[PDB]
Design a protein around this ligand. Structure first.
Ligand SMILES: Cc1cc2nc3c(=O)[nH]c(=O)nc-3n(C[C@H](O)[C@H](O)[C@H](O)COP(=O)(O)OP(=O)(O)OC[C@H]3O[C@@H](n4cnc5c(N)ncnc54)[C@H](O)[C@@H]3O)c2cc1C
Lengths: 16, 670, 133
């Protein structure tokens, strides 16, 4: 899942 | 945050509201007056802090009370209920701590725990520390399961879990203070490198790099918007995947690039045709003029002296000829307008392509990164739900476990009854109890039977999924459980570990990308990690590639590895590797995959279904409804923390609490 | 809430690029053609207009009549009265034209003329004669 990402975290469609 | 509200945060709780679980153990409080809630909340928060400030020693009810002041240390039943609740659910005294009250001597209840993954181990310790009789059955000849660490000389490298994903609110934070984990921070910096077929492998410049990424994220949001606002979630009675959605978006971006150009050239013509009309008027007028000038000439010509009509002619034609020269002049004016209004548009073309061939290749690397994160083809993820656990992200930078992640499960194993090389084959649960039938992996006819009050099943979803079964449930699990099992996704990702005698890469840089030549293989060796003390380079195999690379030999794999690397660092800076490993998680029969993902047609709710314990029918008909007997923990069981070590750890604690409430009773709930 | 900035995702377009398996590549071919069938339209008119421009080559230069700047006047020479009557027969009420033909009378003088000589130069008849064209 997105939470796995270390390199170049995706951003799009996340809610900050 | 910090103070006592730091504590609530570092324990994944709202510092100023009671959670649903708290409402369950304390309906007296939460339904009661606001004032007491804050007392509760404060007591809770203070105890958390107390435990957290020092998680190497058990925190007892006495030790707690000792450190509280009025009005808080006034009511002591409360302080006792709160302390007990926290202890029971592994919010305090979980992991590896010194006990102050050495273990109560005869034990109550008997639990078999299938698998010594982290989830298993975390449960076991809890239960044991709650005074139960606990036995773990482990198929492999080691603990830790999907935490698998490669050792040899000075080389250390995880083929399984590898990163702590930020300490902020992470239970692993606590563990790391209880265990010699060597936590190194990972620096964000990640250069990508298009190899160019056989041509010159070259970095991607800071310009593309940034606009392609930016475009990728723009495209993700699109899918989210497409999902949540437009409700684009079912297409042909099939649920829509993230992959599909990304396609549909990309297409509509291509479509629009074109609708743009079409209207731009349609503007060029509608102008270029005002010109075609004008030039016509102008050519016809230069006719009329040419010929009027002739007429006036001929009337001039008639040498004086002239009668008045013949003089009128000259004058008249003269006027007329000037009139027409006014006109043909307003029109060369007008022509002047258009002629440049055309050199306008014709110099501001709209965008040519949506994405170049070189662009879409980098875009694919981003797509691979996602496929790595979810261990799966984007064509398999849920559009609506793939990212459902986002709110629960930790904070702080990610870290590697420098001395190898296995250090954790090993440490947790200390003091436990773990039977290695024992492969559960059958699980039998009935109103009066449970037996687990296992065989010895080395001579699989030598059989074992285990009798117990309750079974905690931490089998991988990959395992629970085997058709035909590797573990038999007697009786069979109910439709509701086995459908959650089908629906959920269990993906796959692999690792290639490279051991050399020398650093030949940029020491200060932890991660770097490789951008290959096709969508079809975006996953293949797409990302490299430099994490360890010794000279080790580690490479991901993700997406569709992961499955395919499993039927390819190590040599061939290390082949393409060295290729790519020579490509980047120069043919002669890249020596033969002294030692190599290649994980094969789908093939590994005790895993049958790497970790779970929300498949298309599933949702985070299937994770809840997974964790729902099983209650057998009654032996004698008409006999009272039984106790539940079969419990589940594991990465595939914690909706808010899927696919991770800390997620697994957590699920372990979860069940150890739920099992203790069932079999030792819940003191704290009155 | 709304799409990302200038990402284009209208409800309508979505339904059309999904309604079947290749309704995607179909739509992007109507367009890929519509575009080539308009680029050719362009070059064709570019080529027409280029030829029309070559006929306009030279301007109206060899047909321009030198600037005559002579001073306006008050007295009607018989000669000028006669220009008038003809200018009227030919131009009806276009006082500016009549004015330019006579050369040295303002548009008002020309208008005055219409009143002062109405009876003498039957300007009524002359006007209704110009009307029959
Ligand atoms: C390549 C890879 C990288 C990862 N990286 C990270 C990371 O960086 N950070 C992170 O947080 N998470 C990471 N994860 C995921 C993480 O490793 C898992 O979520 C976690 O280890 C799962 O623990 P578990 O206890 O639920 O299951 P497991 O560890 O799989 O435990 C199940 C146990 O059951 C045993 N077993 C299976 N069948 C039987 C049977 N028939 N009888 C008896 N025993 C049986 C297995 O041997 C195993 O010990 C990664 C996973 C992979 C695959």
């Amino acid at each position: 899942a997105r939470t796995m990402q270390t390199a170049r975290k995706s951003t799009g469609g996340k809610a900050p | 945050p910090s103070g006592v509200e730091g504590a609530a945060f570092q324990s994944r709780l709202p510092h100023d509201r009671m959670t649903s679980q708290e409402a369950a153990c304390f309906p007296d409080i939460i339904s009661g007056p606001q004032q007491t809630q804050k007392v509760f909340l404060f007591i809770r928060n203070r105890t958390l802090q107390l435990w957290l400030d020092n998680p190497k020693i058990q925190l007892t009810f006495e030790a707690t009370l000792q450190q509280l002041e009025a009005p808080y240390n006034s009511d002591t039943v409360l302080v006792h209920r709160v302390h007990s609740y926290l202890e029971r659910h592994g919010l305090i005294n979980f992991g590896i701590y010194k006990r102050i009250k050495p273990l109560p001597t005869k034990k109550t209840g008997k639990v078999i725990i299938i698998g010594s993954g982290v989830s298993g181990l975390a449960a076991a310790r809890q239960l044991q520390s709650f005074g139960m009789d606990v036995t773990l059955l482990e198929a492999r000849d080691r603990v830790g399961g999907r935490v698998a660490t490669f050792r040899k000389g000075n080389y250390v490298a995880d083929l399984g879990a590898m990163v702590v994903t930020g300490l902020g609110g992470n239970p692993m934070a606590v563990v790391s203070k209880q265990v010699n984990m060597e936590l190194a921070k990972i620096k964000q910096k990640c250069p990508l490198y298009e190899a160019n077929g056989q041509a010159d492998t070259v970095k991607v410049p800071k310009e593309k790099d940034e606009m392609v990424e930016q475009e990728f994220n723009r495209l993700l949001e699109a899918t989210s918007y497409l999902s949540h606002q437009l409700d684009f979630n079912v297409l042909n009675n099939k649920p829509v995947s993230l992959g599909q959605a990304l396609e549909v978006v990309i297409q509509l971006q291509e479509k629009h690039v074109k609708d743009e150009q079409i209207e731009h050239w349609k503007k060029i013509v509608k102008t270029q045709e005002e010109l075609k009309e004008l030039l016509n008027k102008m050519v016809n007028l230069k006719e009329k003029i040419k010929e009027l000038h002739q007429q006036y000439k001929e009337a001039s010509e008639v040498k004086p002296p002239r009668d008045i009509t013949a003089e009128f002619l000259v004058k008249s034609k003269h006027r007329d000829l000037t009139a027409l020269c006014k006109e043909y002049d307003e029109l060369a004016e007008t022509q002047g307008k258009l002629e440049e209004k055309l050199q306008e548009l014709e110099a501001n073309p709209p965008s040519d392509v949506y994405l170049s061939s070189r662009d879409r290749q980098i875009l694919d690397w981003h797509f691979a990164n996602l496929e790595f994160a979810n261990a799966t083809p984007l064509s398999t993820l849920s559009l609506k739900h793939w990212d459902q656990d986002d709110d629960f992200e930790f904070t702080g930078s990610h870290l590697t476990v420098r001395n190898g992640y296995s250090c954790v499960p090993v440490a947790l194993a200390e003091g436990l009854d773990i039977k290695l090389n024992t492969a559960v084959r059958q699980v039998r649960y009935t109103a009066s109890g449970c037996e687990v039938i296992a065989v010895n992996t080395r001579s699989t006819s030598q059989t074992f039977i285990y009798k117990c009050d309750a079974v905690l099943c931490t089998l991988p979803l990959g395992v629970l999924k085997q058709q035909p079964p590797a573990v038999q449930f007697v009786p069979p699990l109910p439709e509701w459980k086995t459908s959650a099992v089908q629906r959920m996704g269990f993906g796959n990702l692999n690792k290639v570990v490279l051991c050399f005698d020398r650093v030949f890469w940029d020491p200060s840089v932890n991660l770097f990308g490789h951008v290959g030549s096709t969508t079809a293989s975006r996953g293949e060796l797409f990302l490299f990690w430099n994490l360890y003390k010794a000279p080790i380079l580690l490479a991901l195999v993700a997406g569709e590639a992961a499955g395919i690379m499993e039927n390819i030999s190590d040599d061939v794999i290390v082949g393409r590895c060295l290729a790519i690397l020579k490509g980047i660092f120069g043919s002669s800076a890249v020596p033969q590797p002294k030692e190599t490993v290649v994980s094969r998680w789908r093939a590994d029969p005790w895993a049958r995959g790497s970790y779970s993902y929300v498949a298309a047609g599933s949702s985070g709710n299937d994770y809840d279904l997974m964790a729902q314990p099983i209650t057998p029918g009654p032996s004698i008909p008409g006999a009272p409804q039984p106790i539940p007997r079969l419990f589940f923990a594991g990465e595939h069981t914690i909706r808010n923390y899927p696919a991770t070590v800390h997620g697994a750890l957590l699920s372990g604690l979860r069940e150890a609490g739920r099992i203790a409430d069932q079999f030792l009773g819940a003191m704290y709930t009155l | 809430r709304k799409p990302p900035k200038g990402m284009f995702l209208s409800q309508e377009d979505v339904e059309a690029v999904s309604a079947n398996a290749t309704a995607a590549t179909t739509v992007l071919r109507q367009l890929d053609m519509e575009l080539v069938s308009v680029k050719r339209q362009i070059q064709n008119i570019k080529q027409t207009n280029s030829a029309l421009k070559e006929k306009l080559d030279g301007g109206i230069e060899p047909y321009r009549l030198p600037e005559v700047i002579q001073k306006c006047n008050a007295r009607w020479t018989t000669e000028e009265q006669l220009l008038a009557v003809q200018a009227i027969r030919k131009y009806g009420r276009d006082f500016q034209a009549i004015s330019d033909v006579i050369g040295n009378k303002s548009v008002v003088q020309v208008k005055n003329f219409f009143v002062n000589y109405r009876r003498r130069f039957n300007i009524d008849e002359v006007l209704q004669e110009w009307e029959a064209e």
